[PDB]
Design a protein around this ligand. Structure first.
Ligand SMILES: C/C=C\C=C\[C@@H]1O[C@](O)([C@H](CC)C(=O)NC/C=C/C=C(\C)[C@@H](OC)[C@@H](C)[C@@H]2O[C@H](/C=C/C=C/C=C(\C)C(=O)c3c(O)cc[nH]c3=O)[C@H](O)[C@@H]2O)[C@H](O)[C@H](O)C1(C)C
Ligand SMILES: Nc1nc2c(ncn2[C@@H]2O[C@H](COP(=O)(O)OP(=O)(O)O)[C@@H](O)[C@H]2O)c(=O)[nH]1
Ligand SMILES: [Mg+2]
Ligand SMILES: [Mg+2]
Ligand SMILES: [Mg+2]
Ligand SMILES: [Mg+2]
Ligand SMILES: [Mg+2]
Ligand SMILES: [Mg+2]
Ligand SMILES: [Mg+2]
Ligand SMILES: [Mg+2]
Ligand SMILES: [Mg+2]
Ligand SMILES: [Mg+2]
Ligand SMILES: [Mg+2]
Ligand SMILES: [Mg+2]
Ligand SMILES: [Mg+2]
Ligand SMILES: [Mg+2]
Ligand SMILES: [Mg+2]
Ligand SMILES: [Mg+2]
Ligand SMILES: [Mg+2]
Ligand SMILES: [Mg+2]
Ligand SMILES: [Mg+2]
Ligand SMILES: [Mg+2]
Ligand SMILES: [Mg+2]
Ligand SMILES: [Mg+2]
Ligand SMILES: [Mg+2]
Ligand SMILES: [Mg+2]
Ligand SMILES: [Mg+2]
Ligand SMILES: [Mg+2]
Ligand SMILES: [Mg+2]
Ligand SMILES: [Mg+2]
Ligand SMILES: [Mg+2]
Ligand SMILES: [Mg+2]
Ligand SMILES: [Mg+2]
Ligand SMILES: [Mg+2]
Ligand SMILES: [Mg+2]
Ligand SMILES: [Mg+2]
Ligand SMILES: [Mg+2]
Ligand SMILES: [Mg+2]
Ligand SMILES: [Mg+2]
Ligand SMILES: [Mg+2]
Ligand SMILES: [Mg+2]
Ligand SMILES: [Mg+2]
Lengths: 62, 371, 82, 205, 85
RNA sequence: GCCCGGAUAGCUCAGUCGGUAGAGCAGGGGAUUGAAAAUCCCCGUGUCCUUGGUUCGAUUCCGAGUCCGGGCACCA
RNA sequence: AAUUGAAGAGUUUGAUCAUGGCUCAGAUUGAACGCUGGCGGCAGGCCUAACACAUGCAAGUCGAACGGUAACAGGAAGAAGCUUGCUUCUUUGCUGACGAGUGGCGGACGGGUGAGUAAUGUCUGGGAAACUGCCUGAUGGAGGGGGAUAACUACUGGAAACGGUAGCUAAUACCGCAUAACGUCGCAAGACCAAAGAGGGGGACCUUCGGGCCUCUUGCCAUCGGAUGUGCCCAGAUGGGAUUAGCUAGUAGGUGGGGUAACGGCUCACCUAGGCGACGAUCCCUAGCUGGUCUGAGAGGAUGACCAGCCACACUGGAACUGAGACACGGUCCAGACUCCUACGGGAGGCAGCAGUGGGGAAUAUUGCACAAUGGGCGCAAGCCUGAUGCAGCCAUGCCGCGUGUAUGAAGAAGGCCUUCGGGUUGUAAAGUACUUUCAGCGGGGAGGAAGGGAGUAAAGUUAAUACCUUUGCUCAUUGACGUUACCCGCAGAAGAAGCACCGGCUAACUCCGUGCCAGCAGCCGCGGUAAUACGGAGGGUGCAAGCGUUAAUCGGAAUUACUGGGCGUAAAGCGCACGCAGGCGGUUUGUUAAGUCAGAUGUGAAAUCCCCGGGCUCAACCUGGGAACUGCAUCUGAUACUGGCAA
């Protein structure tokens, strides 16, 4: 497959095992999948606040 | 796992620290073959004598292993400096002695190995004096420390003379090293130093119990690198023997339930839930070592990334110096705030060694928790 | 061997037996010929306690069906004169 | 479970008076009712059919303190019943013990009644009950236990109920806090303002 | 597999021994009869049938034969030896 | 746990066997436009994986490390 | 009383109207993942590898079948000390009993899994050519003999596993013989066919003192039954593929012989050449089936996890043996692959039992406690056995309940955010003040699941008998794993307990700042090109709440597979035209038949589940009683208009 890496910025490179959910992007034909940000080797987006259940960010510890 | 380990004769850790191919292992086998006769990776051999219950850990002496040997010599109470009477002091010898001083092992017994190799009362005695002085070199008692001699191979056969000599070796063991103090009071905490996967049982963490007890079935929290996971004990062990309450001060093998082999790496701790919190930033009263201390010899500033060895494993860390200070001169007492990449369970006042460049750099203690 | 026996059903910690004729080899909550009344141990004293269709039972007694100890106790409890 | 937030903002959102801060004192005017839902409360909503439906359902829920789930359960329970769904839903919402207790005057607001019932002050038919969702069967007798009888709050909280319309479907002893639930309330008794029609609509889709 | 109730194995073999032997002798008397039939000696046939009847009923009673097989042998075997006799 | 590799601007890479980092392709700035592309006029815009060392001076020599790949080891 | 029930929206265009897809609003789940996470109740928890499995346990029991006695406890001949009856202590099956052993029974049940299976299965309804241990009804029998062998001793083989030869012995083991009928064969005559005894108590009598005799209990053998269970047979129904049209030689039938509990190409011998197929045979792919579950106004569509019935499998392939029942999960033999043991000569293994491990995977639990309850095995019973079952641990996996406080509280504060800087808003929110304590924390009380069974006693039966025995009252002693139970009472203090998604339209809810077709968002339509209600942050609001989202999946909406309920001049769509077999359909009058059709009746349509009315857990979920429902199928007696068959 060829999943779309969402959020802003990513730690993915070369290999690195990730996690793949469904969902097209409707802008990149051929891409019908998403990456589960925050799950496995794919860290969550840095410094997010709203809608952090997606993108995998934990509740602001501060 | 079948025979119950009866709790008699105080437990004591004791491992060799000699030069490569000086007969450390032959010795660590000889002691057992002798005591198991007349009395009827790091290999942890065991031998029980009427006076004490010793747990010899024979760590490989090569240079590439001066990292895991740290931990192996950390839980150790009194090392057996096995120095060959044919070569005396050597690079690795001094490396371990120095390391066995930075780790801070209280007591030490010198054993001139392979003495039958030479037939002289002046050459062997000479190198003996050499060793006694080299001990004085590192603030060890030196002249006070006993110097046993004898072959480790002859202790393998039936040469009653050398078997007797190494039997008395055990006498010097029980005499020179007193009953150790334990920490059976404050909440239980065990640093992992070796992870196994026994078939039909699962993951088995090992290591000396830093404090407290481990009654089988108690709720435990695995805290350290990566994150944090809950678990419960299921059968504590003692050299392939069963245990009830895993007391403090001795090496054990806890079988953690519901944990995979790859999800509990070496470095984490089995702390009682609510007793500790993992951290990635802390202030510490760092004491830099000089050339007379064997540490660094040149100044450094922010950006310097040395190792911060703790209960077992080390971890690279970012150094941030307090304002009013430009650079850190070697041999100074200065505090600083550190941010290590891998989170490690720690509290205030925790002792630790800042090693770097294949050599130690500066001892320190944790001042304040931040994370 | 046909036998009359309680079938243990109902909730957890809240047993509700259903006396029933069934082959002895059958699973407890398994196959059966016909249920014949019920027993309610935790019912206490109220509108109901233990129903039991004596006619069919009597049909199976002369049919060779061995009544189990509990069900026998119930046959006693429903009596024939009380 | 419970809402336990600003129990007066909701009253502003619904624009009417949910009697949430019905309180001991009478009429509020201590919140700028109606024309102040929030920062953009001055806005006049276009208000879509859905909008009025949802708005209605919420009004009613905020009245009786019932959440969405339990509510929808009440709905399915109303549809499976006889009569007509509209009367049903409100009769079942009326059946809740915290609601009946509230009607008796045993407590100022409805949430007060809830906090009373939950801490074993309420005893119906001699059988003490905690659950507010307990549906009070017709011809029951709700009361207050002696160990919690006339304990400060309940007194004044019952003095309050004297100004209320007071239901004809239930009665109160007033002399020893020994009330008596009777018939199932007629539709033309409660409400006559909250619209069951729109609620029936909302779950019909 | 290790199981104390393995006595069923050694006993079932110790049983197939005897039972097999009996089953054998029976079917061999039956054979004797069939040969009598093929020879055409209706007299010696009747004789052999008389010689086998009690030993088939006797083994049929012992559960070795289901006394259907016994009646079956007695049935058709008689139909033959008397169809010729 | 250990040994051996790979990590040079946005992307793909040349660059050494210490002397002061380039190549192509992209991207930025001014003109033009609603904003672009084309067109014109100008620019590397880089923690040579991080840090330390030996050096006057290290991408380039020697340690310790992180991330990855590969090999060996790992039954209280 | 018992289904009172069917909603639409966005998007093709400059706009419309159609057509036509796409998408959303619902319900659902054995779900996973992200964030957050207090409690209780009831359920659920390896859907991928029928992958490989360390270790423990999952099936034993009967001394009232027997010879025994290896332990243990009592008793006795005798023994040694010494307080000579207080102790030491060898013999002794003689009792209580009970390893190993023979024998009986069970081990074919219970538990698991769904690989194989497109019918050798399942479901529905009938059927005849059967058997059926245990349980039970009826009627008789139960006479008299023998020979073996395990154990056990002697010796000896093998490392173990595991025997070998030679002796001794018992029985409800084994075996003739007597004995027989409404039993088996036969037309009958006639022929033949079985077995076991043990335990309790006992007056006379009889004792070579082994006991005979009496009696109750139980087991034994035969037959006919009953019930139950199983085998078998037929019809209908039970996935997709014609880009699979022919397949079949034990094949289709017959006759005879054998074979099975039983019919039968079930199997041979010969004979006839048939049999199946366009109402889809064969071949291919996929699949356990059903009651049901989900959805739906219904018809339908998807599914069949838990619960229950059936079927199939037990490392792989094959085979039989024992038995009432297997061609057998924790049996046997054989081969094979795979693991381990060895003294290398040979042996051991089968977790799709419960836990557990590795591996796979997005993904699924304790190497728990107990037989106290229900059920099973065995036994006279006591008891034993039981990973069935009952509980407990675990996981928000789901449903349901509750809590996280209530009332008062304007200075309408601080801070935050916004502004036309006048103010607003967060906001009765907070602090303040007054009460409250559920739920967790702590300390006390405390149900119910327990019925039985044992000891004793009186009575009525039994009987030669006030003895034993069976039954019923009646007394004492008692039986709980859950379990520091539910539940109540007391203690302290608001005290320990709120998140998640969203805010352009669909869709409930808006602004400010940061960025500038970049970074990003996106279910659809789409936003971002320096004034973004669409990105990121903040403020505010909305939704839901111990959860909230996302993803995957099914149905709905979708009358977009239309049977109910669509189309085909131009939107997708009349074969280029004809002839025509099978198939479908068929004018009109009379007769008959009654196939369809309809009416009635009876049988069945397992229980649960769904629905309705009640009952019980404080409510709910859940449990539960009765009822209706199970839209079906079959036989039976009618009707005869309409259709079909036959007739004129
Ligand atoms: C360092 C390795 C493991 C240590 C781990 C940690 O050690 C500790 O931090 C430990 C606490 C005692 C600790 O501090 N160790 C961390 C550091 C500790 C430093 C301490 C003690 C100092 O004293 C101030 C220490 C130098 C002091 O000098 C004396 C020795 C001088 C020798 C000089 C040799 C020199 C020049 C030399 O030529 C030389 C050589 O031969 C070989 C190699 N290279 C050299 O160059 C004596 O030996 C004293 O010990 C804790 O025990 C932790 O719990 C720990 C176990 C995590
Ligand atoms: N001849 C002799 N050799 C000895 C004696 N003791 C030890 N050795 C040698 O030491 C070696 C074993 O030591 P080893 O375990 O390799 O050293 P380590 O690994 O550094 O402990 C053997 O090769 C022996 O030959 C002795 O007494 N006599
Ligand atoms: Mg070595
Ligand atoms: Mg809820
Ligand atoms: Mg347009
Ligand atoms: Mg067992
Ligand atoms: Mg005596
Ligand atoms: Mg025995
Ligand atoms: Mg005799
Ligand atoms: Mg016999
Ligand atoms: Mg006859
Ligand atoms: Mg024939
Ligand atoms: Mg025949
Ligand atoms: Mg399959
Ligand atoms: Mg397997
Ligand atoms: Mg047989
Ligand atoms: Mg079996
Ligand atoms: Mg097995
Ligand atoms: Mg298992
Ligand atoms: Mg039991
Ligand atoms: Mg302000
Ligand atoms: Mg409590
Ligand atoms: Mg009771
Ligand atoms: Mg009782
Ligand atoms: Mg009780
Ligand atoms: Mg009693
Ligand atoms: Mg709107
Ligand atoms: Mg968004
Ligand atoms: Mg802006
Ligand atoms: Mg925004
Ligand atoms: Mg449809
Ligand atoms: Mg159409
Ligand atoms: Mg067209
Ligand atoms: Mg035409
Ligand atoms: Mg025609
Ligand atoms: Mg006609
Ligand atoms: Mg008809
Ligand atoms: Mg039914
Ligand atoms: Mg109720
Ligand atoms: Mg009915
Ligand atoms: Mg007609
Ligand atoms: Mg006609």
């Amino acid at each position: 497959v060829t999943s779309y890496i969402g959020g802003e910025g990513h730690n993915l490179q070369e290999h690195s095992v990730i996690l793949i959910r469904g969902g097209r992007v409707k802008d990149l034909p051929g891409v019908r999948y998403h990456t589960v940000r925050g799950a496995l080797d794919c860290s969550g987006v840095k410094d997010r606040k709203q809608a952090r259940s997606k993108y995998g960010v934990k509740r602001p510890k501060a | 796992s079948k025979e119950k380990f009866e709790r008699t004769k105080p437990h004591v850790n004791v491992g060799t620290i000699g030069h490569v191919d000086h007969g450390k292992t032959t010795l660590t086998a000889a002691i057992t073959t002798v005591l198991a006769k007349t009395y009827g990776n790091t290999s942890h051999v065991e031998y029980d004598t009427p006076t004490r219950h010793y747990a010899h850990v024979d760590c490989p002496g090569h240079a590439d292993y001066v990292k895991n040997m740290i931990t192996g010599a950390a839980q150790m109470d009194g090392a057996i400096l096995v120095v060959a009477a044919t070569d005396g002091p050597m690079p690795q010898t001094r490396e371990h002695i120095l390391l066995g001083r930075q780790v801070g092992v209280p007591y030490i017994i010198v054993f001139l190995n392979k003495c039958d190799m030479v037939d002289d009362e002046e050459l062997l005695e000479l190198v003996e004096m050499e060793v006694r002085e080299l001990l004085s070199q590192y603030d060890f008692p030196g002249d006070d420390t006993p110097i046993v001699r004898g072959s480790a191979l002859k202790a393998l056969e039936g040469d009653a003379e050398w078997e007797a000599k190494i039997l008395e070796l055990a006498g010097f063991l029980d005499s020179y090293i007193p009953e150790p103090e334990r920490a059976i009071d404050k909440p239980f905490l065990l640093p992992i130093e070796d992870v196994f996967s026994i078939s039909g049982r699962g993951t088995v963490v090992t290591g000396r119990v830093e404090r407290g007890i481990i009654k089988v079935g108690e709720e435990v929290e695995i805290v350290g690198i990566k994150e944090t996971q809950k678990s419960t004990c299921t059968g504590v062990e003692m050299f392939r023997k069963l245990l009830d309450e895993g007391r403090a001060g001795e090496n054990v093998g806890v079988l953690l339930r519901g944990i995979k082999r790859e999800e509990i790496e070496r470095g984490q701790v089995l702390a009682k839930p609510g007793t500790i919190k993992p951290h990635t930033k802390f202030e510490s009263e760092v004491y830099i070592l000089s050339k007379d201390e064997g540490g660094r010899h040149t100044p450094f500033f922010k950006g310097y990334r040395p190792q911060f060895y703790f209960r077992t494993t080390d971890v690279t860390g970012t150094i941030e110096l307090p304002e009013g200070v430009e650079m850190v001169m070697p041999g100074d007492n200065i505090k600083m705030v550190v941010t290590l990449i891998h989170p490690i369970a720690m509290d205030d006042g925790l002792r630790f060694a800042i090693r770097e460049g294949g050599r130690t750099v500066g001892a320190g203690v944790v001042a304040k928790v931040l994370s | 061997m046909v036998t009359i026996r309680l079938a243990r059903h109902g909730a957890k910690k809240r047993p509700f037996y259903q006396v029933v004729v069934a082959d002895s080899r059958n699973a407890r909550n398994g196959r059966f010929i016909e249920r014949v009344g019920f027993f309610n141990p935790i019912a206490s004293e109220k509108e109901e306690g233990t129903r039991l269709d004596l006619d069919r039972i009597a049909h199976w007694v002369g049919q060779g069906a061995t009544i189990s100890d509990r069900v026998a106790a119930l046959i006693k409890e429903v009596n024939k004169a009380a | 479970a419970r809402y336990l937030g600003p129990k007066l903002k909701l009253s502003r959102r619904e624009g009417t008076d949910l009697f949430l801060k019905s309180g001991v004192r009478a009429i509020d005017t201590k919140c700028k009712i109606e024309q102040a839902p929030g920062q953009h409360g001055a806005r006049k909503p276009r208000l879509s059919d859905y909008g009025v439906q949802l708005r209605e359902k919420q009004k009613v829920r905020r009245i009786y303190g019932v959440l969405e789930r339990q509510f929808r359960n009440y709905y399915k329970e109303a549809a499976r019943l006889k009569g007509n769904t509209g009367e049903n839903l409100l009769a079942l919402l009326e059946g809740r013990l915290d609601n009946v207790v509230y009607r008796m005057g045993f407590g100022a607001t409805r949430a007060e009644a809830r906090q009373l019932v939950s801490h074993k002050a309420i005893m119906v038919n001699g059988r003490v009950v905690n659950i507010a969702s307990y549906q009070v069967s017709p011809n029951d007798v709700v009361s207050i236990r002696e160990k919690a009888k006339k304990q400060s709050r309940v007194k004044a909280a019952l003095e309050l109920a004297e100004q209320r319309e007071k239901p004809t479907w239930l009665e109160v002893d007033a002399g020893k806090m020994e009330g008596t639930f009777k018939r199932k309330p007629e539709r033309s008794d409660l409400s006559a303002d909250i619209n069951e029609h729109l609620i029936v609509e909302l779950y019909s889709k | 597999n290790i199981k104390s109730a393995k006595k069923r194995a050694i006993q079932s073999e110790k049983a197939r021994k005897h039972n097999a032997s009996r089953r054998s002798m029976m079917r061999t008397f039956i054979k004797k009869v069939y040969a009598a039939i093929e020879a055409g000696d209706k007299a010696a046939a009747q004789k052999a049938f008389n010689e086998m009847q009690p030993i088939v009923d006797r083994q049929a009673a012992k559960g070795l034969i289901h006394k259907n097989k016994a009646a079956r042998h007695k049935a058709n075997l008689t139909a033959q030896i008397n169809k010729l006799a």
